[PDB]
Design a protein around this ligand. Structure first.
Ligand SMILES: O=P(O)(O)O[C@H]1[C@H](OP(=O)(O)O)[C@@H](OP(=O)(O)O)[C@H](OP(=O)(O)O)[C@@H](OP(=O)(O)O)[C@H]1OP(=O)(O)O
Ligand SMILES: Nc1ncnc2c1ncn2[C@@H]1O[C@H](COP(=O)(O)OP(=O)(O)O)[C@@H](O)[C@H]1O
Ligand SMILES: Nc1ncnc2c1ncn2[C@@H]1O[C@H](COP(=O)(O)OP(=O)(O)O)[C@@H](O)[C@H]1O
Ligand SMILES: COc1ccccc1-c1ccc(CN)cc1Cl
Ligand SMILES: [Cl-]
Ligand SMILES: [Mg+2]
Ligand SMILES: [Mg+2]
Lengths: 324, 324
């Protein structure tokens, strides 16, 4: 397969010392969980149990993500990445790294966010709200991309929104990774609906643009009121669901441009599909959220070719955000 | 001790939401320092290392103040105040807040000022130049005072003057504080020469008028060519240097009025002093910078009683500024 490199922030990690990007050598200092009293369960997940808590030393509400001890390299990478991004625009703030004395279970302590419900926002968000919140996510992505980090799990559940205070935080940095140009990464990242074509065709030399695909999936689901936009039932089907909108002609041009090898499992399910016009997804239910600007912006995000996709910084200059 | 409050802008912070002055809760968004390339060192305070720099995204000269990580509350207060005052007349403009990815060191980014040398100005400034620059500082003071902020470190080193373009900027807002009427403040603020009598007698319920005393010290050093005007060798000796000029009779009256208690360490050193006439400091070396209006203005700034001092707004109305 043909090699590939990011169009932006290509060498930001190469021009930094080992200590910045080397998470496996970085020393983590685990505090005492006794400084925090647990209140209520909030969420759950891929090897985690989130709780609301109070820091008993200053009476502040915090969130305690109690990690299910899986690969130690993974915990170290999340801690290193959160530590490197701490302070960044719309990035969840890691406040402490603690261990419960008895259980010895690793736990991460974050700033508390009053998360408005996915279904509650999906019903109340105006055309202005979409542009505003999309822009806020772009601040977070351009920032972590400038810091040489690919989030690799962009989706609505990993975006905490407090609509009342108009606050947005990009959370769940457990799959995030340092970008090193020419590196081959595991393609078993991101949630199925948000997986870029590069992960589905098993093209390992992917970059920050992966997150731009995932962001495109989110925008399409909001403006068209169709969640998820690309509804795959499995990883193989996921590509088919992409091809049914972007067409099979550009999919082959993409695989050919990078000399990728398809899985014999695909020919029997892929088929032949025409490219669809973005306006065909417009209906009475969503037309108040749709605009020519929105369709042009989406079309520039949802591209098979990961190099042809708008960068977070280019995305910030798009006419769709002029009203913000 | 008797309570006291400012004569102007007394309740400006009380009539504003918590967001405005609660710097400890305010969320700071740290950008990427990679947008800036460092050129050279400029200054080196007790709290920071100041560097000239280039913004590599637009080829603009900026100043990057690399904060030595001391109390986090202090950094937050400085940021919040700079953010609140951003745009004000003759106030240094905070352009960015960034952190170097590797060092994770907090740094503040300001507009660049071509600072003319303290000793170079002291030798070239005419009677007119003094009146002009004195007025520009007053604009900055009246502004931050109207915004409920006390600079608390007014002195020539924290005033940047670009004489060529006649530009003045009040910098170094790291000791600045929100004024809340009736609050007791730490008296270990300002530089020794510029400390108002209230700090020396350990009177904690001080206001904006502290900034007017410091300004008076600056004026006296310029018009009389004697830097510093009140040359204390320590914080106790500092009150003695003032009393040798203002006299010990008014000193005691001031102490009695607010019921302040003197430190047994002043007994042996204070002594008895007559009030000196301001014309006693006129000599051949400085007589071209002195005038009756200059002496009247100074006399109205250099008063023991912090409530009897001109406010920045009253000072602008003074006959000393009619030629400007
Ligand atoms: O005598 P001090 O109370 O200490 O303070 C200063 C200082 O004195 P020192 O540095 O010798 O301690 C000046 O000295 P420099 O810093 O310039 O070297 C000195 O000036 P000269 O060296 O010119 O004598 C000046 O005295 P003056 O301005 O009256 O000549 C004097 O100031 P005070 O009289 O205000 O204390
Ligand atoms: N800072 C936070 N504020 C509020 N809720 C949070 C926060 N972090 C996590 N949660 C809740 O926990 C859930 C899982 O958190 P996340 O970090 O995504 O863990 P996982 O990796 O298990 O998904 C989120 O969907 C959210 O409901
Ligand atoms: N905007 C600026 N333009 C030019 N020089 C500056 C500027 N800001 C700071 N400096 C230089 O840096 C020095 C120290 O800056 P300052 O804000 O006073 O820091 P500190 O509180 O650590 O003393 C100043 O005395 C001045 O020489
Ligand atoms: C005693 O100083 C002053 C008195 C009156 C007016 C201006 C100044 C002044 C302010 C800042 C700088 C720059 N370091 C230089 C000077 Cl001369
Ligand atoms: Cl200077
Ligand atoms: Mg400064
Ligand atoms: Mg300074």
């Amino acid at each position: 397969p043909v090699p590939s490199r990011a169009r932006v922030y290509t060498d930001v990690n190469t021009h930094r010392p080992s200590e910045y990007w080397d998470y496996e050598s970085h020393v983590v200092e685990w505090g005492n969980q006794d400084d925090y009293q647990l209140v209520r369960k909030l969420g759950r997940g891929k090897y985690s149990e989130v709780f609301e808590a109070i820091n008993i030393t200053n009476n502040e509400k915090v969130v305690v993500k109690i990690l299910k001890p899986v690969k130690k390299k993974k915990i170290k990478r999340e801690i290193k990445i959160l530590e490197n991004l701490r302070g960044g625009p719309n990035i969840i703030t890691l406040a402490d790294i603690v261990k419960d004395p008895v259980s010895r279970t690793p736990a991460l302590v974050f700033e508390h966010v009053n998360n408005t419900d996915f279904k509650q926002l999906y019903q109340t968000l105006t055309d202005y709200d979409i542009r505003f919140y999309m822009y806020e996510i772009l601040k977070a992505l351009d920032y972590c991309h400038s810091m040489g980090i690919m989030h690799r799990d962009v989706k609505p559940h990993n975006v905490m929104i407090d609509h009342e205070h108009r606050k947005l935080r990009l959370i769940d940095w457990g799959l995030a990774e340092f970008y090193h140009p020419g590196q081959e990464y595991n393609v078993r990242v991101a949630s199925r609906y948000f997986k870029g074509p590069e992960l589905l065709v098993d093209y390992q030399m992917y970059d920050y643009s992966l997150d731009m695909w995932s962001l495109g999936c989110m925008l399409a689901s909001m403006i068209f009121r169709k969640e998820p936009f690309f509804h795959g039932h499995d990883n193989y089907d996921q590509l088919v669901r992409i091809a049914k909108v972007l067409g099979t002609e550009d999919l082959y041009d993409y695989i050919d441009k990078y000399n990728i090898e398809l899985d014999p499992r695909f020919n029997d399910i892929l088929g032949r599909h025409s490219r669809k016009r973005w306006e065909r997804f417009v209906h009475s239910e969503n037309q108040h959220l749709v605009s020519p600007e929105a369709l042009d912006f989406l079309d520039k995000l949802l591209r098979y070719d990961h190099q042809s996709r708008l960068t977070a910084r280019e995305a910030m200059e798009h006419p769709y955000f002029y009203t913000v």
